Design a protein around this ligand. Structure first.
Ligand SMILES: Nc1ncnc2c1ncn2[C@@H]1O[C@H](COP(=O)(O)OP(=O)(O)O)[C@@H](O)[C@H]1O
Ligand SMILES: Nc1ncnc2c1ncn2[C@@H]1O[C@H](COP(=O)(O)OP(=O)(O)O)[C@@H](O)[C@H]1O
Ligand SMILES: Nc1ncnc2c1ncn2[C@@H]1O[C@H](COP(=O)(O)OP(=O)(O)O)[C@@H](O)[C@H]1O
Ligand SMILES: [Mg+2]
Ligand SMILES: [Mg+2]
Ligand SMILES: [Mg+2]
Lengths: 519, 522, 518
């Protein structure tokens, strides 16, 4: 009474993929929420990291199963689009694949499951969008709450009083909240140096350099005139093959005199423009600084800095306002940046930094410097700050805000199960499985917090069934309560993108029915 | 050769009997069974996982890349793989169908040889049968093109039916027209390189779109403006980095340093003179092919004109097509070089990257498609499916003749082969009947993948085509027999003809080998 | 996660039926080349010790000698051996039919048909085919001349696919005669087949008496007229008193000399008791020692030493005596009778020739070829012919051969299929195709147009001519009633039932679990 489907290989492949996805999901399931702890990854080489970011955990943990690779790619894609929730997305994907293996055991074709999953996705997008509220920028309270919620599940939670305000200052000091619609994170330059503690992180509107000043006679310059240089301050040499022939004893003295005169002329041309500090670009094939040139510059009481990467010139120009100079005749004061102060700062014997502060033309660019005891905490602090910046980026992208702490997915689970109770047929079971497959996030939020998961989820469902929305798990109170009063929120883009990407990834995985090992 | 003397080598062997055709048939049938589970709109795609360098992983449904990536060892499997690659190169799709049909033909051939019938008889019968099938398909090949709306509806139907067997079917109603629009921007020029598919992670697959202009993944200079209105874009293929005189053996030989300083000043002077000659064109956007060093960058920034550096040959050709410019290398005559024009060249942020957006382009000859999925495998599969759709649409734009899909065309040529077989004597008739059965196996496989009663549906279609209804096929949305004219499951005539002919000829060449001789490996 | 063992594996999917089908088809293709009057036999060579070489045609020993690996091949070999034990014919036929049933089974399961559907269709088809074969069976036994002609035809059709075909006209009747000497007793051990090399295979003959491969003693005579044979199973050796724990414990040599004299005297008195029966011949089962042999030679009788259980049983059957062990009362069950006990020489050996035997209940067949392999194949195929002749003597119902019975029962299966709905009908059609694949194979091995001949037979059987089959000496469609290609009904029925049962049992496996080898 129907097709025999003799080949059981596709079913075995699907079960294997589902089991591998579930294994990857519940491997990192213990790293969710403000009570989930971070993992330590020691790769094949002598490198170790202490990470709570789901994307980095999945990248460093070199998986083997194809479904696990699909999940790590999904996590990195969610990081690209959102930047936060890269753990919840993989948890959701694994959980609902685990739910759909039972459906496969019930004799339901994979295409029907995929289409029903897509329909449940379409309903859930509407549920989440209606659940949210509009948000207006330039409101410090909501931005701070979102940044703190992003930072809470990270190692820098205890520093949230010092990192959240600077995390929102960094974003607000780059874009104009009037018409932005996006933010470019490239101009938030993160510089890391060993030493100090996390509490000494700083935000500077100026520029930070890791290079060292060539002349150790001046380090502090007040009312500095900065100027980039893209040509070489050495003996002249043409692009074509160059040779100097000497046939007299006076030729040697003459050639030395001409070299010295040319260098001194270049340095005098630089100095007569009022330049106070010099930024020399890193030039391979020609020493950008010579001993004679540096000697003359130091004699004229100037500060010289070399070995500046070609990729940083745009950042420097956007920050302090200089314009690149590739010819001496074009070097004038009309294209010479200015700053209130240039300093060479010592970090209590743990390195040296260059700080340019008080640029008279403050560009749309700030810099963050981080301090820490060991390398691992510094890297984790960088990742946490980046996640907070990405959260603010999502909030800027589309202006919508939802409650956190398990409220969105549990409310969606309800609304979707009563949606399934109106679609009687073969797809009713699949939609109900989708609805009950996202109870995993609140369950794990309750579990990692030490609460009883079953009772907590039951109370959550009951309280959202009574219309008391924005209710979720509180770890400070140690129970269940309203979340907005607890100041825990997240942008709608995070959750909506997580759900959409997870559903798309699962719908793609469910279409696999064979695996072949290529040569 | 089993003789008590061995002559070949330590490693070389010969199979000069039913062993050789046994190996060839089992290899071909193995390839066909590998491809079989990826047919029809209900087919399911496969995972290709490496066993070595970088462990490349790709999710794919089309059989061309499946047969290309895996390493076959049976020479018959090599013939099938080369068949699939050639068929993919020729038109763009039908690789799965041609491999499946050739495998089914070889299975029928082995069944025939089991009845002790000489292979040349099978070859002659198949030659006659494929002639009859060619004639039937050509006779049933409806044609459009004189009308405008009918041809565009045909294009939409062809895109939908070619994209329906891939992942993109999940958003079929959104994607097919997209593909159609792309080809409709080429104005009949069969240059698929004018289509650029930029893939970036993030966002659902429904967020893909065809831009109303061009997207370039390059960088602006330092001091250049980041936004230009009503540009006059000049596209060039000059060096303008160091500009070697290109006269090898030239060197400076001077007795003082001031001479070298003067020579280098003269070099920078000739750079400035060349940049001034370029600026004499009256332009505000300059596009190069190779790098622009710091001095020309500064000259451009002082002038106030944009400069796009290091755009490969494809980039400059696509910008010339989409904007109307002319690839230049010398600028002695500004009145002979034609300059392209756009409306806005602002920067647009997609994903986490910034791209140059030529909007309001003068000509739509070239365009770009942005693919934004959830996984790198999803991106690769989407790109491959879109490439297949574009190839088929360009082919049917070149040749507007179309035949009905869903199994109707292959059913009708199978019926023609059956009618031919019913009037021929001798052992060739059974060969023709086997050919017809192998040709009819394709809709059987489609229904099997779908999960319907394949035998009942195939018998229904056989009766429908024997009675006289030549526009009947499979309705997948419910799994019944329907009228393809109403459903509009069209297909390119050239694609079907290529599948039929290539499968027939490769089956013929494989069928007539009675000795496999392997030299010792390297 | 793997759980079984190192070396233990499981195939729980299409792989299992793939292995089973490929093994069954390998068995079928190996056995297929030995059907019909034009089939060609095979050489079996052992790669192990003694490098045994045997030239054989029947499928039973071919399948039992080779070491099969696939469990389905083991199923087929066991079925062939069991069918050889039951009747002794059609082992190749049953194996081939089972192979084609499994081939059509895999073809059907390619069309996505549940195996239990095929099982039900096959059960219905085999019920209909068995009913049709029983309805088409002709019987004799009441008649005398007609039944003898039927026996000759059965021997001919059983012996025409083997090497003795070269002299078939000579051999068939001989085999029949042997069975006609059994007088209805289902005792094939009453037939002795003595194989001696040298001379053409047409020198083989069924003796008009019995032949014994033993030796006369030293002083006994080597020829008797009007023999009075006494057949015994006594000791005639040292012949211990059997009272374990008996020993001589004396104090002089005279005592033990007296005891040994008493032993010799008791042996002499036992020989006297034997002689009191009034005999001139004596056949013993175990050895006869020197003193009884001397006494027999002095008396004037003829003694046979070490004639095993089979030998004395055959002598009792062919002569009528009883196997004596105690000679207290000679007046009880009596002796046997013959007319000559001449020693006759065959090749280089001498055998005792019992001629003019009182009863023909046992006999000997002398096989004489030019090669030991020829002798072995002649012996095996003659054994098959004798088995079939004895079976049809026990049950005289016969059905026509040459594919006629197969064609008619396949026609009945087709008619049943045409009137049954559902996916059962295609299962029965596949059953009929597999059943008709046998005469196709016979024609193929013959080398004719198999498709044309099978189409002609199908048309002739559908029309109503229910006695049409393959005439192979000319290669056309002939009448088995006129021609005389008969066959035992029991053989064909057992072939059909065993093949269908083996196909059914093999087809319904979906998981093969192999434990780690020892
Ligand atoms: N203070 C808090 N109380 C309750 N739930 C929280 C709190 N902070 C974060 N969460 C929840 O933890 C979940 C996961 O957040 P997080 O672990 O920071 O990111 P990721 O999911 O990328 O690891 C969020 O869905 C959020 O609802
Ligand atoms: N929606 C549909 N309904 C019926 N038949 C279809 C449909 N879509 C595709 N087909 C048929 O499936 C066949 C195989 O196409 P596809 O699976 O894309 O592989 P290929 O294009 O390589 O042959 C085509 O001949 C087409 O006629
Ligand atoms: N002389 C003959 N003419 C036609 N058919 C024959 C002849 N001899 C045998 N057959 C057919 O060939 C089939 C197999 O015969 P045979 O090889 O003798 O079986 P086996 O090897 O078991 O003795 C039988 O079913 C019989 O009907
Ligand atoms: Mg987070
Ligand atoms: Mg296609
Ligand atoms: Mg026989």
């Amino acid at each position: 009474k129907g097709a025999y489907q003799d080949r059981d290989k596709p079913a075995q492949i699907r079960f294997s993929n589902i089991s591998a996805a579930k294994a990857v999901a519940d491997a990192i399931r213990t790293s969710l929420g403000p009570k989930g702890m971070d993992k330590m990854i020691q790769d094949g080489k002598g490198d170790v990291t202490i990470t709570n970011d789901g994307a980095t955990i999945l990248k460093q943990m070199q998986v083997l199963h194809p479904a696990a690779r699909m999940l790590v790619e999904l996590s990195k894609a969610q990081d690209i689009e959102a930047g936060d929730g890269t753990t919840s997305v993989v948890i959701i994907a694994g959980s609902l694949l685990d739910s759909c293996t039972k459906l496969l055991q019930k004799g339901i074709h994979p295409t029907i499951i995929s289409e029903s999953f897509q329909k449940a996705l379409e309903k859930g997008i509407e549920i989440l969008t209606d659940m949210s509220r509009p948000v207006e920028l330039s409101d410090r309270e909501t931005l701070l709450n979102s940044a703190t919620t992003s930072l809470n599940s990270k190692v820098v939670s205890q520093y949230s009083s010092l990192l959240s305000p600077m995390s929102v200052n960094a974003v607000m000091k780059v874009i104009d909240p009037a018409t932005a619609t996006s933010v470019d994170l490239r101009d938030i330059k993160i510089v890391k140096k060993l030493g100090g503690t996390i509490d000494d992180c700083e935000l500077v509107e100026g520029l930070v350099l890791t290079q060292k000043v060539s002349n150790s006679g001046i380090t502090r310059v007040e009312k500095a005139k900065i100027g980039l240089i893209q040509f070489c301050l050495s003996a002249p040499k043409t692009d074509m093959d160059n040779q100097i022939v000497v046939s007299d004893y006076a030729q040697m003295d003459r050639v030395l005199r001409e070299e010295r005169a040319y260098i001194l002329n270049l340095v005098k041309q630089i100095k007569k423009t009022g330049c106070n500090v010099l930024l020399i670009q890193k030039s391979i094939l020609r020493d950008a600084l010579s001993d004679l040139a540096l000697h003359f510059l130091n004699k004229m009481k100037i500060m010289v800095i070399k070995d500046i990467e070609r990729e940083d010139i745009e950042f420097i120009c956007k920050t302090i306002g200089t314009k690149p100079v590739a010819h001496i005749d074009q070097f004038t004061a009309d294209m010479l940046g200015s700053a209130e102060l240039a300093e060479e700062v010592n970090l209590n014997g743990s390195g040296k930094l260059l700080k340019i502060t008080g640029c008279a033309s403050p560009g749309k660019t700030v810099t963050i410097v981080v301090r820490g005891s060991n390398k691992l905490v510094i890297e984790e602090a960088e990742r946490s700050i980046h996640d907070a910046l990405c959260v603010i980026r999502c909030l800027v992208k589309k202006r919508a805000l939802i409650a956190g702490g398990g409220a969105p997915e549990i409310e969606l689970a309800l609304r979707l199960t009563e949606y399934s109770r109106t679609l009687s047929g073969m797809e009713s079971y699949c939609v109900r499985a989708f609805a009950d497959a996202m109870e995993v996030i609140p369950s794990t939020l309750a579990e990692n917090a030490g609460l009883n998961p079953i009772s907590t989820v039951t109370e959550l469902r009951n309280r959202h069934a009574q219309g008391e929305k924005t209710a979720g798990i509180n770890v400070r109170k140690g129970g269940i309560s309203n979340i907005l009063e607890e100041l825990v929120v997240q942008p709608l883009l995070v959750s909506v993108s997580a759900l959409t990407l997870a559903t798309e990834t699962v719908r793609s995985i469910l279409k696999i029915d064979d695996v072949v090992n290529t040569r | 050769s089993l003789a008590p003397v061995n002559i070949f080598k330590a490693g070389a062997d010969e199979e000069r009997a039913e062993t050789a055709r046994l190996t060839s048939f089992i290899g071909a049938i193995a390839i066909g069974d590998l491809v079989k589970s990826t047919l029809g709109p209900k087919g399911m795609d496969k995972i290709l996982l490496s066993s070595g360098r970088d462990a490349s992983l790709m999710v794919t449904n089309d059989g061309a890349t499946i047969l290309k990536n895996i390493g076959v060892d049976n020479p018959a499997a090599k013939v099938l793989v080369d068949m699939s690659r050639v068929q993919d190169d020729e038109v763009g799709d039908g690789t799965t169908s041609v491999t499946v049909l050739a495998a089914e033909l070889l299975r029928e051939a082995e069944s025939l040889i089991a009845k002790k019938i000489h292979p040349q008889t099978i070859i002659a019968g198949w030659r006659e049968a494929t002639k009859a099938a060619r004639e039937a398909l050509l006779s049933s090949a409806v044609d459009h093109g004189s009308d405008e709306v009918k041809f565009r509806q045909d294009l939409m139907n062809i895109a939908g039916t070619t994209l329906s067997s891939k992942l993109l079917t999940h958003h079929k109603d959104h994607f097919t027209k997209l593909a159609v629009e792309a080809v409709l921007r080429l104005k009949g020029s069969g240059n698929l390189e004018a289509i650029h598919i930029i893939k970036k992670l993030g966002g659902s697959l429904a967020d893909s779109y065809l831009d109303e202009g061009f997207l370039l993944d390059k960088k602006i200079g330092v001091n250049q403006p980041k936004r230009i209105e009503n540009a006059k874009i000049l596209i060039a293929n000059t060096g303008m980095d160091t500009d070697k005189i290109k006269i090898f053996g030239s060197r400076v030989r001077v007795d003082s340093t001031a001479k070298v300083a003067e020579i280098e000043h003269a070099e920078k002077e000739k750079m400035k003179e060349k940049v001034e000659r370029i600026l004499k064109h009256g332009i505000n956007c300059f596009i190069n092919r190779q790098l622009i060093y710091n001095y020309p960058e500064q000259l451009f920034g002082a002038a106030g004109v944009m400069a796009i550096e290091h755009a490969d040959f494809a980039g400059v050709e696509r910008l010339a097509l989409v904007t109307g410019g002319e690839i230049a290398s010398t600028f002695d005559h500004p009145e002979l070089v034609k300059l392209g024009s756009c409306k806005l060249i602002e920067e647009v942020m997609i994903g986490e990257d910034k791209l140059i957006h030529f909007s309001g382009v003068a000509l739509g000859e070239a365009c770009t498609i942005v693919l934004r999925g959830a996984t790198q495998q999803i991106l690769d599969e989407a790109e491959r499916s879109l490439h297949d759709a574009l190839c088929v649409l360009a082919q049917t734009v070149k040749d507007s003749r179309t035949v009905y899909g869903g199994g109707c065309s292959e059913m009708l040529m199978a019926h023609a082969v059956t009618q031919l077989a019913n009037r021929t004597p001798g052992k060739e008739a059974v060969a023709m009947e086997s050919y017809a059965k192998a040709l009819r196996m394709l809709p059987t496989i489609i229904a099997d993948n779908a999960g319907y009663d394949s035998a009942d549906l195939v018998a229904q279609l056989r009766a429908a085509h024997s009675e006289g209804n030549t526009t009947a096929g499979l309705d997948m949305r419910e799994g019944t027999i329907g009228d393809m004219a109403i459903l509009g499951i069209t297909e390119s005539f050239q694609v079907k003809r290529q599948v039929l002919l290539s499968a027939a000829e490769a089956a013929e060449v494989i069928l007539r080998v009675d000795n496999i001789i392997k030299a010792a490996p390297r």
